[PDB]
Design a protein around this ligand. Structure first.
Ligand code: SF4
Ligand code: SF4
Ligand code: FCO
Ligand SMILES: [Cl-]
Ligand SMILES: [Fe+2]
Ligand code: NI
Ligand SMILES: [S]
Lengths: 481, 277
């Protein structure tokens, strides 16, 4: 009574993903995810001037390039000994945070919303599954489409904000070792704040409400997709120049317990990944990337990262759970009205609902709101005209690690410099943590496990397989690099 | 609206994101009024084997008349195992396979982005997947379909949209074969539409006076001097970024920092190190 289903490509994600599930008695009972495309940035980078890395590594992903830019320049800062000016710290936060808004808006509306909203009767919105389980009223559905179309302009405006101090987007020019390449002027800070107002309004008035609204028509989706119920956050957006206070603070959550984040406890397994057997079990400081595309038993170009042997998830859910901030006003309101739930802080959703298919869409909308306040702060904190960069020399031999949170989860770059050239460069990315295969111990990756128990009551219209995946906002370019 | 299939090989999806930033026309207008984007895995409604089957049904219906956009390079090593883009009939589909299947039957191939056009970062020093430019991979396999390169890492949205409109207006006025001939006439030796890649950045740079005076910025944040000593590759780059700029006109690379020559065939290695001349 076991049926295997294969989905390749999973669409309305970034990058190349095959999902294979076994369905039994109307539910997933096993799962395997395959990242099908490899480029090998960690070898491509070797031998280069380290400053090149903060451009090369952005081409890992055109959706989240500012996250790779940030991790890279932070790693180079430590390796070079560069003291980033206070004003450059703030400019970086303005550049990067603006893409948090773009990416989260892009994900819900232009990747996720078609899970619940029927679009216009033309490609690429048709054809689709005959029984797509699209539950919304004609009135709410059209609101979905109207907001989808509006979100196209809103997310474009987010990239205008990125480019004001970042140079262009995708692939910013404005972040380098030592700070930020362009001092914010009063004039362009107005241009930034003007656009920010429009995005704030769309976020508060349209995006956050509609996530709660649409979820209420899908309350069964809060009861599936829990997986391991274990989360990772490495910290992001420095709030001072001490390196200790951050908008998101690091932390691990596993087996109901909060624990601190210790990066020496990260290892990358490759038994079921297409990399040479001899490279398994490595911390990123000793990481190796030797492709083995014919290796028997392997089924993915994604390595299997494990935290102290744990398989964790990352992303807005992970961050909001770890940081347990205050929920937004309209979130409290609509959790009361539409779900009969009383909540003040994010964890008042409780572990089961937060760690759910629909909970991760909720966490992402709440985080988008949360970020509005951070950006407002930096727009006040910034000092128009004050220098944003130092010009440091290339070290002959050095190492550094840059930690941040990409829109989709924890991201670190580690660089080792030898002879003033890149000797090793290792990337542990967000969707790597989510969409990885089994480790050498046979423990499944986070989404592989979160797929367990997903309903497939109609093997010919198995829409919940990819809906669950999309809740994690995957980016297989990031996962494999 | 002609049918368009958008296939991604060794890409970072930056080509698709930059297209979403199109201002005039907006992306909604492009999709709803200019092209019929029949397959695009990042934005389309359906999924998996059904999305591929749909593309084949449209490809078989519109044989010789559909436009094929290729993002990313094509890895030929290990029998194509470095880029699997789908599965139909329990049969994995590599980018090599998919390009041999659809390439011959397209009206034209638009290689968008420096990876597809010229190989780019996946083909750079240190790589080991056999990343290949589209025009090269097709020639190597005897496929005569015309290729138009729209390079850049990423291209400006106006370069992609502009080239599609350019070719559709040519085809309306002169038919399919004649319209495409008129398009080839406006391509430079690197396959690029000269409307967008016909002018050198440096020769049109607003800091050209400082360059000739020898007044060079020594820190990035110094917006008075020429950026040449900081590594600007404007002198070796063919694009109109000095004029149309980026993201609704709010900035461009030379104002903000340096040009890194992302539209040129030798990107990245021939433009590296980025931060010294
Ligand atoms: S070297 Fe660069 S900044 Fe200087 S004039 Fe040329 S294009 Fe402009
Ligand atoms: S200015 Fe140079 S690096 Fe920037 S987009 Fe144009 S060609 Fe590419
Ligand atoms: N966000 C984003 Fe990209 C991924 N996953 C990174 O890191
Ligand atoms: Cl980002
Ligand atoms: Fe890695
Ligand atoms: Ni990404
Ligand atoms: S991403």
């Amino acid at each position: 009574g076991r049926t295997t289903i294969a989905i390749d490509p999973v669409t309305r994600i970034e990058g190349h993903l095959k999902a294979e599930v076994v369905v039994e008695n109307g539910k997933v009972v096993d799962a395997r995810l395959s990242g099908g495309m490899y480029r090998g940035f960690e070898t491509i980078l070797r031998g280069r001037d380290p400053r090149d890395a903060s451009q090369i590594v952005q081409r890992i992903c055109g959706v989240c390039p500012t996250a790779h830019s940030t991790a890279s320049v932070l790693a180079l800062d430590e390796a070079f000994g560069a003291k980033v000016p206070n004003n450059g710290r703030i400019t970086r936060n303005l550049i990067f945070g603006a893409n948090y808004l773009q990416s989260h808006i892009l994900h819900f509306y232009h990747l996720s919303a078609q899970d619940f909203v029927q679009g216009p009767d033309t490609a690429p919105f048709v054809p689709r599954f005959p029984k797509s389980d699209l539950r919304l009223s004609k009135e709410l559905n059209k609101a979905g489409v109207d907001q989808y179309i509006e979100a196209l302009e809103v997310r474009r405006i987010c990239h205008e904000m990125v480019a004001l101090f970042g140079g262009r987007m995708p692939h910013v020019q404005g972040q380098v070792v030592g700070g930020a390449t362009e001092i914010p002027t009063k004039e362009k800070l107005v241009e930034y704040a003007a656009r920010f107002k429009k995005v704030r309004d769309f976020v508060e008035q349209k995006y956050v409400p509609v996530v709660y609204t649409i979820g209420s028509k899908y309350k069964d989706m809060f009861k599936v997709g829990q997986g391991f119920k274990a989360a990772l956050c490495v910290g992001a957006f420095p709030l001072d120049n001490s390196g200790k206070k951050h908008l998101f603070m690091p932390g691990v959550y596993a087996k109901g317990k909060d624990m601190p984040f210790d990066p020496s406890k990260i290892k990358e397994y490759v038994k079921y990944s297409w990399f040479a057997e001899e490279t398994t079990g490595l911390n990123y400081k000793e990481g190796k990337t030797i492709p083995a595309p014919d290796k028997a038993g392997a089924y993915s170009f994604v390595k299997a990262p494990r935290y102290d042997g744990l398989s964790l998830e990352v992303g807005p859910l992970a961050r909001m759970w770890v940081n347990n901030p205050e929920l937004s006003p309209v979130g409290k309101k609509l959790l009361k009205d539409l779900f009969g739930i009383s909540a003040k802080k994010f964890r008042d959703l409780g572990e089961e609902a937060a760690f759910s298919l629909m909970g991760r869409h909720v966490a992402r909308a709440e985080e988008t709101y949360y970020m509005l306040g951070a950006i407002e702060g930096w727009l006040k904190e910034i000092k128009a005209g004050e220098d944003t960069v130092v010009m440091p020399a290339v070290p002959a031999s050095a190492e550094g690690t840059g930690f941040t949170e990409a829109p989709r989860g924890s991201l670190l770059h580690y660089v080792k410099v030898k002879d003033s050239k890149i000797d090793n460069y290792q990337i542990v990315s967000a969707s790597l943590w989510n969409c990885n295969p089994r480790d050498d111990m046979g423990q499944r990756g986070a989404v592989e496990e979160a797929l367990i128990g997903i309903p497939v009551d109609d093997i010919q219209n198995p829409v919940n397989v990819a809906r669950l995946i999309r809740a994690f906002d995957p980016x297989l370019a990031c996962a494999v690099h | 609206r002609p049918p368009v299939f958008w296939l991604q090989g060794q890409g970072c999806t930056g080509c698709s994101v930059t297209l979403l930033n199109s201002v005039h026309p907006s992306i909604a207008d492009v999709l709803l009024k200019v092209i019929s984007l029949e397959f695009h895995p990042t934005v389309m409604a359906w999924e998996g084997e059904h999305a591929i089957e749909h593309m084949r049904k449209v490809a078989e219906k519109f044989k010789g008349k559909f436009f094929l956009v290729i993002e990313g390079s094509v890895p030929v090593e290990a029998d194509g195992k470095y880029c699997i883009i789908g599965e139909a009939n329990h049969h994995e589909i590599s980018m090599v396979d998919a390009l041999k299947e659809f390439g011959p039957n397209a009206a034209a191939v638009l290689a968008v982005g420096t990876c597809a056009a010229y190989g780019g970062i996946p083909a750079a020093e240190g790589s080991e997947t056999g990343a290949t430019a589209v025009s090269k991979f097709l020639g190597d396999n005897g496929i005569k379909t015309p290729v138009v390169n729209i390079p850049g890492c990423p291209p400006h949205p106006d370069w992609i949209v502009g080239t599609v409109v350019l070719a559709l207006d040519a085809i309306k006025k002169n038919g399919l074969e004649g319209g495409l001939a008129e398009v080839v006439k406006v391509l430079d030796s690197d396959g690029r539409p000269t409307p967008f890649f016909g002018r050198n950045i440096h020769e049109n740079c607003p800091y050209l006076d400082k360059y000739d005076e020898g007044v060079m910025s020594a820190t990035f944040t110094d917006k008075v001097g020429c950026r040449y000593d900081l590594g600007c590759k404007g002198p070796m780059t063919m694009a109109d970024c000095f004029e149309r700029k980026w993201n609704g006109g709010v900035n461009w690379c030379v104002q903000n920092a340096v040009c890194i020559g992302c539209v040129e065939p030798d990107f990245p290695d021939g433009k590296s190190p980025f931060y010294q001349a």
